[PDB]
Short mmCIF file of C-alpha atoms and ligand atoms in Angstrom, two decimals:
data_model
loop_
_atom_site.label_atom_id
_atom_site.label_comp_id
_atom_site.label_asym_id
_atom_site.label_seq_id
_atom_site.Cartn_x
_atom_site.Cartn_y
_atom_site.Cartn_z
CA UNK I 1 -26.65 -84.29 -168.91
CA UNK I 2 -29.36 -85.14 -171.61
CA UNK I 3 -32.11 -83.47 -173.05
CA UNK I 4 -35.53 -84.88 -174.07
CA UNK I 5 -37.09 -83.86 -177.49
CA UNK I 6 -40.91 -84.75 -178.21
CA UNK I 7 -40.88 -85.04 -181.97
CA UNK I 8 -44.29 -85.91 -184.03
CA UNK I 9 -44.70 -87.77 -187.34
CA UNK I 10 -47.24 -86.63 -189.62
CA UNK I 11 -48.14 -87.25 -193.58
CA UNK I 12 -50.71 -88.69 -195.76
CA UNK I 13 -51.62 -92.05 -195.42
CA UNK I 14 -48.70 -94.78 -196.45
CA UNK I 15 -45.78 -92.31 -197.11
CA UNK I 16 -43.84 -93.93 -194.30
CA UNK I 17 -44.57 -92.64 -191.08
CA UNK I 18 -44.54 -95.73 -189.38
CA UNK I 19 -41.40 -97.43 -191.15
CA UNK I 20 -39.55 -94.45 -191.11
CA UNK I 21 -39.99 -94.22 -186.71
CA UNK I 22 -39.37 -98.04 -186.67
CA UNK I 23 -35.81 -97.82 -188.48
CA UNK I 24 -35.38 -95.29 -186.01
CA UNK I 25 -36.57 -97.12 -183.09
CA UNK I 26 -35.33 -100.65 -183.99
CA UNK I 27 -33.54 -100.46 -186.75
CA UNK I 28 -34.70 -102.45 -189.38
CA UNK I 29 -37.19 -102.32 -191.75
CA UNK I 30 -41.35 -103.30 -191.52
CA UNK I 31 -42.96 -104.27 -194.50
CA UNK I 32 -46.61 -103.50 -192.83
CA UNK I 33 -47.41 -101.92 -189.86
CA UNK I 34 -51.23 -101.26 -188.74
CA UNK I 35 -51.85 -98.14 -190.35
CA UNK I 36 -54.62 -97.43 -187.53
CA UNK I 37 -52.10 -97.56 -184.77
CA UNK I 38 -51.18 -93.59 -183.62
CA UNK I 39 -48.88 -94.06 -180.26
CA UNK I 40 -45.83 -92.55 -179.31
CA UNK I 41 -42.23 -94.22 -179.18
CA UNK I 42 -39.39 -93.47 -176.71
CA UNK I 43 -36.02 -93.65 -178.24
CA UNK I 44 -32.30 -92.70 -176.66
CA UNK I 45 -29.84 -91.85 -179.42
CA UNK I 46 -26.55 -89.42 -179.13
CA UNK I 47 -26.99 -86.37 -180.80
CA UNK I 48 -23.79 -84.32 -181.38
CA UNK I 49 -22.11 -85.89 -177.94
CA UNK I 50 -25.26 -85.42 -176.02
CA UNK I 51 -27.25 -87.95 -174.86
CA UNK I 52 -30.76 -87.31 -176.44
CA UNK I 53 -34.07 -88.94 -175.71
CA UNK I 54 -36.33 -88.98 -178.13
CA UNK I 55 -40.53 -89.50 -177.80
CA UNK I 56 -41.98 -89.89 -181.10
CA UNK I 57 -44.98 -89.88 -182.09
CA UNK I 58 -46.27 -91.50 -185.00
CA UNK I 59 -49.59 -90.50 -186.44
CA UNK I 60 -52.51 -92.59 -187.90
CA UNK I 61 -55.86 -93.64 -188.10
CA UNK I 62 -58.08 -90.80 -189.89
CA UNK I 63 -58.80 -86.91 -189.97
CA UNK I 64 -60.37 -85.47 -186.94
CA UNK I 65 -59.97 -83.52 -183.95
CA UNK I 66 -60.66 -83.60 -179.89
CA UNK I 67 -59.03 -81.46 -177.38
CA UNK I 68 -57.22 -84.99 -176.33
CA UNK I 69 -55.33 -84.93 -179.84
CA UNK I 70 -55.14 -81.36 -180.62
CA UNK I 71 -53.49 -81.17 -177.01
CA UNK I 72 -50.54 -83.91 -177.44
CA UNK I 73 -50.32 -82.63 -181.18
CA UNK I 74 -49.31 -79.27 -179.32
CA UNK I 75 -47.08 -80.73 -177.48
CA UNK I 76 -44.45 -81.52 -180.25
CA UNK I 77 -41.64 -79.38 -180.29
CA UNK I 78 -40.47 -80.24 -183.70
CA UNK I 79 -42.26 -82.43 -186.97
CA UNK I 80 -41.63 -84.10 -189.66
CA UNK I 81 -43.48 -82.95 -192.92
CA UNK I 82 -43.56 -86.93 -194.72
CA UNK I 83 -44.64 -87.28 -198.42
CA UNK I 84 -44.10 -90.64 -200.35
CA UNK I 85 -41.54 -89.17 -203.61
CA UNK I 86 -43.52 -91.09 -205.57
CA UNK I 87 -46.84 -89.64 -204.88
CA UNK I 88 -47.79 -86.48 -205.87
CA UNK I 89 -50.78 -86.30 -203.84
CA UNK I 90 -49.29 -86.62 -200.62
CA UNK I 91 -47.19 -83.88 -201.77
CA UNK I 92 -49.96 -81.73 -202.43
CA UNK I 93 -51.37 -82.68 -198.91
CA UNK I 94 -48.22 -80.77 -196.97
CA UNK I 95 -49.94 -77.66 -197.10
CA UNK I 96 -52.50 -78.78 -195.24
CA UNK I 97 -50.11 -81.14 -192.44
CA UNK I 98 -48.14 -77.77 -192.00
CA UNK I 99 -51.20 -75.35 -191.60
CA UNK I 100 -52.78 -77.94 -188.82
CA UNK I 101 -49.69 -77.63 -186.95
CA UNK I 102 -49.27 -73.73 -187.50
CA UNK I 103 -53.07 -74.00 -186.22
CA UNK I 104 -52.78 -76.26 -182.91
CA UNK I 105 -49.01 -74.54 -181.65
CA UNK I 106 -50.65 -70.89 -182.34
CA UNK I 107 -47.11 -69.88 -184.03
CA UNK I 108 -45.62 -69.21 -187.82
CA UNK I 109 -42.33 -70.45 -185.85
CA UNK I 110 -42.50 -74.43 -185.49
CA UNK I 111 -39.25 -76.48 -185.76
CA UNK I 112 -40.21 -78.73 -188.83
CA UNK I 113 -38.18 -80.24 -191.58
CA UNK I 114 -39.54 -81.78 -194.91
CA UNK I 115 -39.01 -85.23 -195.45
CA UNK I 116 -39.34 -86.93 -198.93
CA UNK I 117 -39.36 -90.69 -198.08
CA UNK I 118 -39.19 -93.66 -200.83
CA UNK I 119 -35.93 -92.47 -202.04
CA UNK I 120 -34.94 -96.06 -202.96
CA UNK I 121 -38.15 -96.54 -205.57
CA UNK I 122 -37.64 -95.94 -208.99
CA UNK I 123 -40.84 -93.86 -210.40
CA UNK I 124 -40.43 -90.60 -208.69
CA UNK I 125 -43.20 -88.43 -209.41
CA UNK I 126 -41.69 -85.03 -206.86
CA UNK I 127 -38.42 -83.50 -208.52
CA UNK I 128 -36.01 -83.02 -205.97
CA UNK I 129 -36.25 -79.39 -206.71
CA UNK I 130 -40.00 -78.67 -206.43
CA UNK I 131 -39.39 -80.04 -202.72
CA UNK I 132 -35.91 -78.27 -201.90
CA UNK I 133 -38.28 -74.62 -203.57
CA UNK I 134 -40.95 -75.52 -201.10
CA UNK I 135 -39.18 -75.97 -198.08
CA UNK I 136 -37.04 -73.00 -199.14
CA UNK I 137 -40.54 -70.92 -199.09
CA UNK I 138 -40.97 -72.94 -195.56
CA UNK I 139 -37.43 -72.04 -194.33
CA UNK I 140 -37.01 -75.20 -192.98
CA UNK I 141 -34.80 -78.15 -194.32
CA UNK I 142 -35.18 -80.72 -196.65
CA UNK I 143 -33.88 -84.12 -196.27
CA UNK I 144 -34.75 -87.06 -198.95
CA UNK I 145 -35.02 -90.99 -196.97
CA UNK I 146 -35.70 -94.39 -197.41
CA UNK I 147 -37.09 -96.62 -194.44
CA UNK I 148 -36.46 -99.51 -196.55
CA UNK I 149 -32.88 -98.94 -196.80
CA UNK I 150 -32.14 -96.48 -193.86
CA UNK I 151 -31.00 -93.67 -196.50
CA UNK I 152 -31.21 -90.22 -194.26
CA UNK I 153 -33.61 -91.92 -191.23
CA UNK I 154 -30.86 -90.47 -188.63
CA UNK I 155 -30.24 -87.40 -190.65
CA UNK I 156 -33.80 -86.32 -191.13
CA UNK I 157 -34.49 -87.12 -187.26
CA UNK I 158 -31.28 -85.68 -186.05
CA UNK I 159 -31.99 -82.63 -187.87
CA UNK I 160 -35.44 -82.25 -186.60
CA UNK I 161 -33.43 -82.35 -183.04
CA UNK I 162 -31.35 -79.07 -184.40
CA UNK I 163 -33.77 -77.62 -185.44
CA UNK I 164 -35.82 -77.72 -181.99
CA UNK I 165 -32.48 -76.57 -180.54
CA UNK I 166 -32.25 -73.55 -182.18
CA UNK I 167 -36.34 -72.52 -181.48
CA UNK I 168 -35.64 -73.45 -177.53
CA UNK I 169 -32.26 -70.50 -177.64
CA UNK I 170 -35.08 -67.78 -178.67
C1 LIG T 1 -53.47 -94.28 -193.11
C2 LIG T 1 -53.69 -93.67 -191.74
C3 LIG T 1 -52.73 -92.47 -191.55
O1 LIG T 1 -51.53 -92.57 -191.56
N1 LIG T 1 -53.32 -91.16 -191.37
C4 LIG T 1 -52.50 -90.04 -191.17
C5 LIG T 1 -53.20 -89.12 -190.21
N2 LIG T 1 -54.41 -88.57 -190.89
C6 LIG T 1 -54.68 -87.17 -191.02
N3 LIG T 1 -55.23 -86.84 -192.16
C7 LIG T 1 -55.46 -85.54 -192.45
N4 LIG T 1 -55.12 -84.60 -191.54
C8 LIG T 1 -54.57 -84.93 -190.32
C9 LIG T 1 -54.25 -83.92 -189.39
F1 LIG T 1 -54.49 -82.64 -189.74
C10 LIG T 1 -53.68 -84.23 -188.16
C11 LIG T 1 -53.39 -83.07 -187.18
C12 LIG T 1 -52.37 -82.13 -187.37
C13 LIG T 1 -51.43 -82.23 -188.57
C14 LIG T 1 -52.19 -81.11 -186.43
C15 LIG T 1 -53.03 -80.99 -185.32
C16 LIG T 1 -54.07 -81.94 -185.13
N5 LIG T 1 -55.03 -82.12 -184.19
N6 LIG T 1 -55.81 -83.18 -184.46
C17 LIG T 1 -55.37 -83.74 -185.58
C18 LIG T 1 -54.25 -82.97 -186.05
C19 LIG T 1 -53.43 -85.56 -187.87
CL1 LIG T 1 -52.74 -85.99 -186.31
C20 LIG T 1 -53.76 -86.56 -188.78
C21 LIG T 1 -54.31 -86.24 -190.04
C22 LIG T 1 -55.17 -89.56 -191.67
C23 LIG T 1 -54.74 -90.96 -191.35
N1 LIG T 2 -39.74 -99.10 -200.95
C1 LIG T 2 -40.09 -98.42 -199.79
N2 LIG T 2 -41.32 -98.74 -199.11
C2 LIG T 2 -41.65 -98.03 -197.91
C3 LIG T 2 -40.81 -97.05 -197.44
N3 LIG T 2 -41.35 -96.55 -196.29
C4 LIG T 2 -42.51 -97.21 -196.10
N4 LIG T 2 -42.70 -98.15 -197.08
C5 LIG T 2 -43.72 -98.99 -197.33
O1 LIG T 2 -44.93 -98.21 -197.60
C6 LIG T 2 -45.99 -98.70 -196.95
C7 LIG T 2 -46.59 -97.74 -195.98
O2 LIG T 2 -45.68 -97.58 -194.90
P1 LIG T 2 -46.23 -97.13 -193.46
O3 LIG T 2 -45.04 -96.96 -192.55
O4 LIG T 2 -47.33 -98.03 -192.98
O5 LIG T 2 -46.85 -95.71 -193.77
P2 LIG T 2 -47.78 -94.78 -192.85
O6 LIG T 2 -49.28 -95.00 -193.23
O7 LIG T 2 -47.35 -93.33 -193.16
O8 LIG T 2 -47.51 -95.13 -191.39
C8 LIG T 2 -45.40 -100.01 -196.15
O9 LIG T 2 -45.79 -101.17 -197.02
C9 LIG T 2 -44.15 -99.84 -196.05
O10 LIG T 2 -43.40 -101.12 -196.06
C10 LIG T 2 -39.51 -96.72 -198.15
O11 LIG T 2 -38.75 -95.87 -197.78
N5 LIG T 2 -39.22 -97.43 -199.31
MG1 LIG T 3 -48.58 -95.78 -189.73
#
């Protein structure tokens, strides 16, 4: 059979959002992507011998909400926490991306994993370790990607899957 996962995208402006669903999508890099464009993506992949389709959506645009977006933001099962590791301010700003979503599904229990993205540019600013000790507080995982150069795109999605699977055996 297959099963269908609705995963959703969310960071601070320019960590990757966009790049990192496009490697996933199409699998290649984009150098610039219209950072006003929020849509969703529909992706099959095999996850662990199962034949998984994927609907992604990638957020954008700016800060406000409407029952329209607060209602298809509830409908993620599963997101991914992006900041840029060379930008400290976006990784200040997860705090915020994971209390939204704690807000809109009414639950401490949302599949999420934390994704450091920029892995392949030299002036980190995020140790590896503050991240891994904040999604240790989370309980969630912690994966560290590049869009440019593909590093950890499948594993960080493909673990978001996982993670949803477990929440859906509750
Ligand atoms: C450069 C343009 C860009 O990529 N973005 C990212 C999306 N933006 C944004 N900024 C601050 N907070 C945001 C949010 F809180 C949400 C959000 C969440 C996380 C959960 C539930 C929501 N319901 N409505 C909005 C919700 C989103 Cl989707 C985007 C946020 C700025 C521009
Ligand atoms: N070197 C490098 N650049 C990236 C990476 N991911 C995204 N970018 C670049 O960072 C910028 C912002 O990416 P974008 O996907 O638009 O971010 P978004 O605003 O979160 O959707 C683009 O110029 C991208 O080409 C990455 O992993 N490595
Ligand atoms: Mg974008």
């Amino acid at each position: 059979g297959m099963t269908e996962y609705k995963l959703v995208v969310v960071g601070a402006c320019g960590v990757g959002k966009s790049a990192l669903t496009i490697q996933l999508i199409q699998n290649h890099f984009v150098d610039e992507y219209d950072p006003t464009i929020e849509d969703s993506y529909r992706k099959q992949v095999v996850i662990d011998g199962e034949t998984s389709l994927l609907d992604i959506l990638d957020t954008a645009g700016q800060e406000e909400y409407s029952a329209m977006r607060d209602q298809y933001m509830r409908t993620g099962e599963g997101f991914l926490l992006v900041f840029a590791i060379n930008n400290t301010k976006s990784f200040e700003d997860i705090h915020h991306y994971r209390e939204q979503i704690k807000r809109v599904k009414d639950s401490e229990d949302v599949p999420m994993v934390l994704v450091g993205n920029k892995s392949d540019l030299p002036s980190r600013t995020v140790d590896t370790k503050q991240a891994q000790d904040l999604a240790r507080s989370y309980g969630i995982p912690f994966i560290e990607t590049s869009a440019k150069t593909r590093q950890g795109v499948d594993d960080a999605f493909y673990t978001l899957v996982r993670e949803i699977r477990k929440h859906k055996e509750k």
